[PDB]
Design a binder for these strands. Structure first.
Length: 131
DNA sequence: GCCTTCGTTGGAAACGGGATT
DNA sequence: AATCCCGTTTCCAACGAAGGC
């Protein structure tokens, strides 16, 4: 069968939002038509306006593909890890993948996440997620 | 009639860790 | 080492029924 729900990218939802703010004198149903989405869908996008724009910023160039702001159960660790290597890149230096995995396992120890393994799946997803 | 909210649940994307490039 | 794979699990978000203007 065909799809039953159309999922949109953060970039697409961002455009829809921007459309409504630049055309306050148009019927919401009119804007929904222009993007070919249920008025129901447009409303929920507008209500999540701030989260959506935050996600678009968060995913950066990946907003062109990312649709969901799903988090990893190790999200707290990912926050610390990012801040960490993002501070190294601020000095114009690259962060070796090997050092990244090492640092993640140490942060996990500190947080008490005994089940974190810095698994291949997790690392790959992180690399493509936080892109 | 227009538009949004509520609630259901479709489906994106998380997971581990062995397989593969 | 970095990626990919895949059976499974977890939970974000789309959209129709309802209901308030």
């Amino acid at each position: 069968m065909g799809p039953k729900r159309r999922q949109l990218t953060f970039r697409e939802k961002s455009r829809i939002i921007q459309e409504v703010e630049e055309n306050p004198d148009l019927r919401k149903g009119e804007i929904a038509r222009r993007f070919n989405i249920p008025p129901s869908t447009l409303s929920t996008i507008l209500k999540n306006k701030r989260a959506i724009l935050a996600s678009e910023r968060k995913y950066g160039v990946a907003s062109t593909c990312r649709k969901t702001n799903k988090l990893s159960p190790y999200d707290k660790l990912e926050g610390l890890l990012i801040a960490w290597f993002q501070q190294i890149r601020a000095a114009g230096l690259p962060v070796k993948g090997i050092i990244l995995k090492e640092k993640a396992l140490r942060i996990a120890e500190e947080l008490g996440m005994d089940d974190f393994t810095a698994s291949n799946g997790w690392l790959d997803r992180f690399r493509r997620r936080r892109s």
